[PDB]
Structures are given as structure tokens and as C-alpha cells.
Amino acid sequence: LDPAAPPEFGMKEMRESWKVHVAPEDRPTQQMNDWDLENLFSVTLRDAGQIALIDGSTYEIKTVLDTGYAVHISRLSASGRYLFVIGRDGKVNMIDLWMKEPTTVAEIKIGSEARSIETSKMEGWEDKYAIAGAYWPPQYVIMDGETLEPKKIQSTRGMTYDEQEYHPEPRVAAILASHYRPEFIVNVKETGKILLVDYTDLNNLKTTEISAERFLHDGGLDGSHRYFITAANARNKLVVIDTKEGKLVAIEDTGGQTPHPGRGANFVHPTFGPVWATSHMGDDSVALIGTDPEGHPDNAWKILDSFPALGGGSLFIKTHPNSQYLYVDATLNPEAEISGSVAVFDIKAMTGDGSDPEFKTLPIAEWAGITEGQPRVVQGEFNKDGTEVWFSVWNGKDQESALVVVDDKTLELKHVIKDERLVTPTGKFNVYNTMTDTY
Amino acid sequence: DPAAALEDHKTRTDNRYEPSLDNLAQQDVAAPGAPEGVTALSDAQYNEANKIYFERCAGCHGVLRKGATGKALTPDLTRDLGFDYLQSFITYASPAGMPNWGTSGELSAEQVDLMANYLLLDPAAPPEFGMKEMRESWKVHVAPEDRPTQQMNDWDLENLFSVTLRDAGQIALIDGSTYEIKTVLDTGYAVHISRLSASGRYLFVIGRDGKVNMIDLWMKEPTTVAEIKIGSEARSIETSKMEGWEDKYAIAGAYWPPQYVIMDGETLEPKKIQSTRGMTYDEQEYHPEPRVAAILASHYRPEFIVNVKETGKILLVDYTDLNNLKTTEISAERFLHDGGLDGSHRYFITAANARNKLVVIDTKEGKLVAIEDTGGQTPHPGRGANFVHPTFGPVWATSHMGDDSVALIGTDPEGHPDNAWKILDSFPALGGGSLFIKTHPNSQYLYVDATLNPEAEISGSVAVFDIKAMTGDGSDPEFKTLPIAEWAGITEGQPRVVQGEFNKDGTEVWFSVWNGKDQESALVVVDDKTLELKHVIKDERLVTPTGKFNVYNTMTDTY
Numbered sequence A: 001l002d003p004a005a006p007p008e009f010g011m012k013e014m015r016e017s018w019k020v021h022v023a024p025e026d027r028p029t030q031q032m033n034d035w036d037l038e039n040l041f042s043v044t045l046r047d048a049g050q051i052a053l054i055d056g057s058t059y060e061i062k063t064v065l066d067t068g069y070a071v072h073i074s075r076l077s078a079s080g081r082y083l084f085v086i087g088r089d090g091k092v093n094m095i096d097l098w099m100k101e102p103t104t105v106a107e108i109k110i111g112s113e114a115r116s117i118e119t120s121k122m123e124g125w126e127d128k129y130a131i132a133g134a135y136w137p138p139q140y141v142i143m144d145g146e147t148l149e150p151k152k153i154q155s156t157r158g159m160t161y162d163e164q165e166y167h168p169e170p171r172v173a174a175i176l177a178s179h180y181r182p183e184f185i186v187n188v189k190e191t192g193k194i195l196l197v198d199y200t201d202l203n204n205l206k207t208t209e210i211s212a213e214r215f216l217h218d219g220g221l222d223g224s225h226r227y228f229i230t231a232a233n234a235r236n237k238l239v240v241i242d243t244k245e246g247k248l249v250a251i252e253d254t255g256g257q258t259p260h261p262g263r264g265a266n267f268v269h270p271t272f273g274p275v276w277a278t279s280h281m282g283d284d285s286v287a288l289i290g291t292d293p294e295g296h297p298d299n300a301w302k303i304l305d306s307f308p309a310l311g312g313g314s315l316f317i318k319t320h321p322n323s324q325y326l327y328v329d330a331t332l333n334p335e336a337e338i339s340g341s342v343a344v345f346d347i348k349a350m351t352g353d354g355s356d357p358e359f360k361t362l363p364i365a366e367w368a369g370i371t372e373g374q375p376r377v378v379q380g381e382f383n384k385d386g387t388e389v390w391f392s393v394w395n396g397k398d399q400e401s402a403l404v405v406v407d408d409k410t411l412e413l414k415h416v417i418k419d420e421r422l423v424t425p426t427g428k429f430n431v432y433n434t435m436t437d438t439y
Numbered sequence B: 001d002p003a004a005a006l007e008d009h010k011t012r013t014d015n016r017y018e019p020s021l022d023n024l025a026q027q028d029v030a031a032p033g034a035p036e037g038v039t040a041l042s043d044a045q046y047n048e049a050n051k052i053y054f055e056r057c058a059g060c061h062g063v064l065r066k067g068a069t070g071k072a073l074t075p076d077l078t079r080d081l082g083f084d085y086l087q088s089f090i091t092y093a094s095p096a097g098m099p100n101w102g103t104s105g106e107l108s109a110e111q112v113d114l115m116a117n118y119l120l121l122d123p124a125a126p127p128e129f130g131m132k133e134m135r136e137s138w139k140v141h142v143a144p145e146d147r148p149t150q151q152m153n154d155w156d157l158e159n160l161f162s163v164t165l166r167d168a169g170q171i172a173l174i175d176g177s178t179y180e181i182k183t184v185l186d187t188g189y190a191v192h193i194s195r196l197s198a199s200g201r202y203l204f205v206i207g208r209d210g211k212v213n214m215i216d217l218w219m220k221e222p223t224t225v226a227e228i229k230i231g232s233e234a235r236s237i238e239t240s241k242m243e244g245w246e247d248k249y250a251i252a253g254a255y256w257p258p259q260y261v262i263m264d265g266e267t268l269e270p271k272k273i274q275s276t277r278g279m280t281y282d283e284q285e286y287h288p289e290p291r292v293a294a295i296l297a298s299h300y301r302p303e304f305i306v307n308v309k310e311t312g313k314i315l316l317v318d319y320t321d322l323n324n325l326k327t328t329e330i331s332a333e334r335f336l337h338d339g340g341l342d343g344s345h346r347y348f349i350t351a352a353n354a355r356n357k358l359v360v361i362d363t364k365e366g367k368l369v370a371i372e373d374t375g376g377q378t379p380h381p382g383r384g385a386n387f388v389h390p391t392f393g394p395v396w397a398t399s400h401m402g403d404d405s406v407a408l409i410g411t412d413p414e415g416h417p418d419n420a421w422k423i424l425d426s427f428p429a430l431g432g433g434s435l436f437i438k439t440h441p442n443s444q445y446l447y448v449d450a451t452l453n454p455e456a457e458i459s460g461s462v463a464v465f466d467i468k469a470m471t472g473d474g475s476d477p478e479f480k481t482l483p484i485a486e487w488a489g490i491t492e493g494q495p496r497v498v499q500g501e502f503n504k505d506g507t508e509v510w511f512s513v514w515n516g517k518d519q520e521s522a523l524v525v526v527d528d529k530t531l532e533l534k535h536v537i538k539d540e541r542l543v544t545p546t547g548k549f550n551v552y553n554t555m556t557d558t559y
């Protein structure tokens, strides 16, 4: 039978869902609670349709807030004051961390299926805007950073970059924010276009539509925050965009199957210099790409090394400037023992001689002490000081889950977080590292 | 109440101006399945109804029936209305289309039923037309390397006129001084407009069917050197006019699919296709059929200026990099159609016709500068008419389809600040149904036609205002009436006079005496200095002459 196109979701629909619980004039003018906001972690309690705000040093759950169902990610405004979360269903909640009791100050629905949201990060534009992307309808929406008022909706339906054929369903994938220009960086999956959207004028809207590679998914900025490196996953490529000049710089095959970097991991390789790393969903490989055209021209935008980690099914790779370690999970691996563990490479020991660097295997799920099921360990996230790294031990909604905190210096267990309210923990986002894009 | 069709569907002068998608209508379609509660149409019946729909209803209601000037007619809506309502409503007929080729708006009893039944069935979206399709249609008849390196014919190219012989799908190249038809070229289907490359060497024509032809005027015998199809229905084309980018690119706009395409200015190779489907500027709701209307070229930046109708967006597309594509999507006003640049070539002034607004864009800064109501009904400027009003200073003028008014808007923000982007004067011309207003820097006269006027006396004449006599004292300036059709001496039918166009020197202005395809038409040349008849062009080959474009005035945007 002929398929019936699902309903659209425009301004009228968004505005009807738009609710401002606490108007800006009624919010505080300074932090009114005594929490260490920058060291706070926003944790997704997936199936419960909630998030937990957890103290990064005491591990105390400061509060559990109701949100949209299965929040995909948490993102922070550039000032670190406002917390934005978006559920699979397209529901966005804006939380004021300055309130005596932080809660949702405004909410809005931006589509039927959505996975991304981000805040304005250009100097001078702090707290000005938020942007959300949807799978359905194929669109992104720029909202007021203070009230969530929907200001500009842009359809992503359009032509594929290569064969230049119309595609009626180009889903918006990752959305990042430029630190070089007042622009949002939007990945459009099926058409293989990366959009640089200038938010200085939403009426006379300037955008740069960059032809990249199809199946764009996730990615991150390099250490200098100038270049966006993203995975065109189904095609095993990493695309590099210069956000300063607003143009494609390179497209390179990682040599692995289905790279899935998350925002990736930037570090200074002892021999190669500045690099960005990604693991893969399709195999056990970890690939490094040079990210320094000025200082290391010969290595810039070239895959410098590829080596195995725990196994396939990896989703997130992580490191921090203060750490000498590179953490790699294997969340989707069919083998319980593997999906419940993390590989850790010693960056200092890397020579880049072509051999496979050794890694230590952390039995994260074992450390959490969970009997039932075969819980999957996922996504490392560092605290503000970059001295501890957290991992979610993801089990079923009616099963026991946990968060495992690892001491980065020793690679030993630091703390196991368990609470009856900790249902299906997945994404974890430290306020400071998220607001500053430190990865 | 179906009786509402009396007003809703009444023929009016400004509503005869709706696109007829007769090219897309030629496409054969399979009949869809009929859901519970609705009777199915056979493949033959559905095809017949589909052709009628595209030819006389899709212009106002949309190919996809999502609505344009007329509301949406999707199955979810029509099924609630019911067959009886639809049958009764459609029985009263629909608005007539353009004269000399458009529909009468009358349907037989069987056709009314076919339409009512058709509206209850789920509309199938017509085919897309992407790169593969374009490249399959792309033909380079004479490679650039094999073309002349200098003009090989002895024609005064800059004084040449490219004239649309509409129904025949041909164009006539006519000498501007001798009035000799130098050649008549075939393209297949009706050409809508002719545009010139910035150098004046290449002549581009766009057919209503999406066919683009590029003609080399330097050839001993000018002919199409390259061709390509860019869609199913199209009405606009333009060339790169930024200094330094002469002959680099050409761009074509389409009604269906909703998209524009940038092509190589030498070979027509399709380089970049952009969909115009998107959100309306004001209510910000997705629109699946935003038609591309007029397209102009910036003289301040290497950009094309693209009007997107249903969404009310004006696009400034930077052609310096087609891979890392820079565009400025300007929220303007819905129903953008035609327009032109002011005398300084810096500001784009365009009519959002259905809303009686003129939208002004600063092409240097790339931003909207003003939106002003003309005070008239349905402005249709063509590219408009720029002149230095004796008291108001630089102004741009437009006439209207819905009434007899001529409106002037100040176009000098620096030199005449108070008058800038304000309607400085409004006065009557011959009558309603006007389509084109015209002047030239070397002329002291402003010409205004009345093509669609229901009165023969008026539709066959032109009003001429003496710019030097304008006082801007609030009173209505007088005008002389030139009996253009009468001067052409045509008996049969009711020929309609349309579009003035000057020669290179601005000493003579031409008008088309547009009659039916099986009737006699003519081109009338008026001596600008005396406002007297100069010459009448008549030829058996001159079938349905409409648009005329002088090479010099088109390549330089002199209007």
C-alpha cells in the first residue's frame, strides 16, 4: 500500500506545546543554591523519563527531575547556568541551575522523533540561543536561550551532496556550536550536508551548506576548537570542517567499520602531536587522525594509526587534558564479559611505531556488583578537574543498574553509585566539560 | 454551501494570472486505490481528471493540493466535504486563465464528476528531477573550444531583440534598427523569457517545460550550442552579472520540482541543484511546493537573487563556491513574484503580489530594508521602471493587475532619505489588468500597458506619462493614450498589447500586439521622441509574440 506521510510539526504545534513555567524576570539574578554547579553531572534515567543531577565530588543525587521520555543528551548553556535536555519524543526541558531548587523553567516539543540539542558558544553570545534537531519531521529549530520561544524552524529536506537527488527524509544528527563564529554546526545525515548556521540574524539567515559525506552522525571539535571532525558512519569516513573558514578540509577512511566517536577524544600523541580519536561499532579498532596543520603539517588530517581495543560494539572513547589515559567501551558487544568492561590505553606509552598498544581491561560491571542480566557499560565522562571518570552500568528498568566512578590516576575503583531512583542510567554530562566542550 | 463558488471561483482580472501546469499535465499517471467510502476512477478517467487538474486548478491549489492562493484540497479535507459538495461547487466553474491560451474555466458535466471524484482520491506526487535526469537531458552541440573566438556575423548584437513566439515554442531574433527578423529558432515548447550573459555573447531561453537552451550570438548563423532540462515546469532564468564573473554561470528556477539549478555558463553542465521546499516565513509551517518565481543577478556581489513564492523567502546565493555553499535566506512576504533592481543596481524591489506589497532588499548588505503596501491591487512590475522624478528624486514604478494604479517608491536612501522606500505617489493609468511599466534613461516617458483589461479599447492601448511634467503635488498626472493595436491594423480577435521594451539607444520602444496562434499578431515600434508610430512588424512566422528583450538592455539591466 501507499505510505501515508506522518504529520508535520511546525510553529503552531511548537507554540502550543511551549510552556514557560518561570519567566526570566522571576528567576534569580545569581546562584541561590549552594551546589557546585560546574562539577555537577546530569545523568539520563532513560526509561523513567527523568534525569538525576549528581554532585561530582560527593556523588550525592542532588535532585531527580521529570523530563521527556528517554532523554538522549544533556547540554549546557555557555555560562553553565541553563541545562537543556531532549527526549527521543522531541520534548525539550530547560532547567535553571541557579534556582534554590532547580527545575524546568520552560519546555517545548520540537518534533516527533529527536536526538540532538545544543547551545550558542561563540564569545559574546552566551545564553542567547539553543537549537534542537529532529529525525522527524526533518528539521532543526533555533529557540530563545532564555525562554525556549521557537524563533526559526528550518527544514532539512533537500538534495544529496553527491548524486544530487532529492531526499524527503534527511534526519538531523549531531549539532555542535562554533567557537570561531556565531554559528551552529548541524549534521544532516541522509544528504551528507553539514550546515553552518549564523544566528546573528534569524530574519536574513546566512548559512553555509557544506557538501561532505552521507550518513553523518556524531562528532566533535579538535583541541583548538577550530575543526569539526565527524563520522559519516555507514561509509567508514571522518569528515573534517574548518569552522573559521567555513569549508570542507578533508574526508578520510578510518580503516575500521562504522566509526562512532561520540564527541571523540582529543589528546597530544607523544610522536604524532595533537590528534583526535574514535572507536567503532562495527569492529574493535581505534583510529587516530592528526589535527594540527600549523604545527604538524605532515600528519594533519591523516589517519596516523589504527589499533584494537576490547572488541566490536564500541560507542564512546574518552580522555581529558589532565589524564594520560584513553578509555574505550564496548557497549553493544554480544559477549557480556566484554560489554561489561572498558579498555584503557596509556597515551604516554604510545610510540606510533605501528605495533598495537597494550591496554588494561577494567571490569566495570563486575566492580558495580550486579547479579541479574548482562548490564552494558557505556560512555565515560570526566569530572571538572579531569581526575575521575564515570561510566554507566546500564541494566533493565526492572533490574539493578549503577554508575561506576574510576580514579583516573590509578585506574582503580573510586565509587559505585546505586539508588532505587537510578533507573536505566545512560548518558552522563559534567556541566563544566559540556559547557566548554572539553574532550 | 456550494453556492460560494460564485465568488470564490469568479473570474477576475487579477486572478486570471495563475500558473497553468500544462507541461506536467501531459505526464501519464496510474490511478490510485480508492479507500473505504470512495468510488475509484479507472486509469483513463483518473488520467483525464489529472490533466484538467494540472492545467486549471494546480496553479491556485497546488500540484500536491496543499494550497497556494486557493486553500488545500487534500483527501482528509475533501472527504469531509463529501462528493455532493464538491460536485455542486465545481459545477459553478473555475476562474479563467490567461488570454490567448489559458482555460475558459468551463467543464462538462462528466468532467465536473471526474474532478469531484479525483479530489477525493489520494494525489500522487509527480516525479522528482535530479542530477541523473538532468545529465541524461544535457547535450552540448558545439563544445566551447569549437565555437568562434570573435563575432563571425555582421549583426549589431547589442541592438538585437529576442522575441518569444509563445505557442510555437520559438524565438525570433530581430534587428533593432532595420526591424528585420534575422532568424527564428525552435526550442520545442513555449519559451517564457530570454536572458543575456553579461558579455552579451550568449542568449539563454527557458521553456515553460523546464528546457533550457543556450545560443551563441557570435556564430555566422546563431543556434543552440547547448541544452538541458532542469524540471517539469519552469519560468525563470538568469546569468551571472557580478563584474569578473561574466559568462561563468546561469541559473534556472522551477515550479516543479520546487528547485533552482546553477549551471556552467559555457556548457550548461548542471553544477548545483537546490530544493526550495521549506518553511513559510511568517507562520513557519512546512510547505511542500514553494515555487521559484523571478531570479535576478547581483551587481554588488557574485550572487543570484531567487524569489521563492509560497514561503515568502528571497534567497541570495553566492556562486563563488558551490561545494561550501553560502546563502542568505531572507524572510520577506508570501507570494513573491517579479521585481527589478533600482537605478543604482543595489536594491532589489519585488512584488509580493497577492498581498499588495513591495519588498526591498539591499543586495550589498544582504538584508531586507522595507516592505510597503502600494495602495493598489496586485502589483505586477515585471522588472519595473526606474527614473529620476523631477521633485521626488530617484524612484521605481509598478502598475497593477487588480486596478488602474501606478505607484512610485523612492529608491535613494542616501540622497533623498525621507522619500526612501515610501510610496510617494499613486495615480491612474488606462485601467486595470496592467502587466508592464517601462522607461529608459534617455526617455522622458513612462509607458504603462493594460493587457488583461476586459475592455478591448483599453487592452489594445498604452498610457504614456511625461516624467518632465510630473510635479508630485498630489494631483494625478495626465497621460497620452497610444492606440497600439489600432496602429498595427489587426481586425480578427481582440489582440492584447503587452510589454514595452526599448532599443539600445532608448530612442524607440516596442510593444507586442498579442493575438491567438491562428490569428494575426504584430510588434509595434513607437518613436519615443514624438510618441508617434514608427514601424509595424508583421510576418506569418510572428505567432503569439509576447516577451521582447533587447540584448543591451537585458545584459546591463537597464530599466
Ligand code: DHE
Residues within 6 Å of the ligand: A046, A070, A071, A072, A073, A115, A116, A117, A118, A172, A173, A174, A175, A176, A217, A218, A262, A263, A378, A379, A426, A427, A428
Ligand atoms: C544523533 C545522535 C547523537 C548526537 C546528539 C547531539 O549532537 O547532541 C547521539 C549521541 C548520544 C550520546 C552522547 C554522548 C556524548 O558524550 O556526547 C549518548 C549518551 C547517547 C546515548 C545512546 N544513543 Fe545516541 N543514538 C542515536 C542518535 C544520536 N545519539 C541513534 O539514532 C541511535 C543509533 C538509535 C536510536 O534509536 O536512538 C542511538 C543510540 C543510542 C543508545 O543506544 C544510547 C546508549 C542510549 C539511548 O537512549 O538510546 N547518544
Ligand code: DHE
Residues within 6 Å of the ligand: B017, B018, B019, B020, B021, B098, B164, B166, B191, B192, B193, B208, B235, B236, B237, B238, B292, B293, B294, B295, B296, B337, B338, B382, B383, B498, B499, B546, B547, B548
Ligand atoms: C516567474 C515569472 C517571471 C519572471 C521571470 C524571470 O525572472 O526570469 C515572468 C516574467 C515574464 C515576462 C518578463 C518580462 C520582463 O520585462 O522582464 C514576460 C514578458 C512574461 C510573459 C507572460 N507570462 Fe510570465 N507568467 C508566469 C511566471 C513568470 N513570468 C506564470 O506563472 C504565468 C502567470 C502563467 C504561466 O503558467 O506561465 C505567466 C504568464 C505569462 C503570460 O501569459 C505572458 C503575458 C505571455 C507568455 O509568453 O506566456 N512573463
Ligand code: HEM
Residues within 6 Å of the ligand: B008, B009, B015, B016, B018, B053, B056, B057, B058, B059, B060, B061, B069, B070, B071, B073, B081, B086, B089, B090, B094, B095, B115
Ligand atoms: C479547477 C477546475 C479547480 C478545482 C477542481 C477547484 C476546487 C475547489 C474546491 C472544491 C473548493 C472548495 C473547497 C472548500 O470549500 O473547502 C475551492 C475553493 C477555492 N478555489 Fe478552487 N478550484 C479550481 C480552480 C481554482 C483556481 C484557478 C483558483 C485561483 C484563481 C481557485 C481559487 C479558489 C479559492 C479562492 C477558493 C475559496 C477558498 C479560498 O482559498 O479562499 N480555484 N476550489
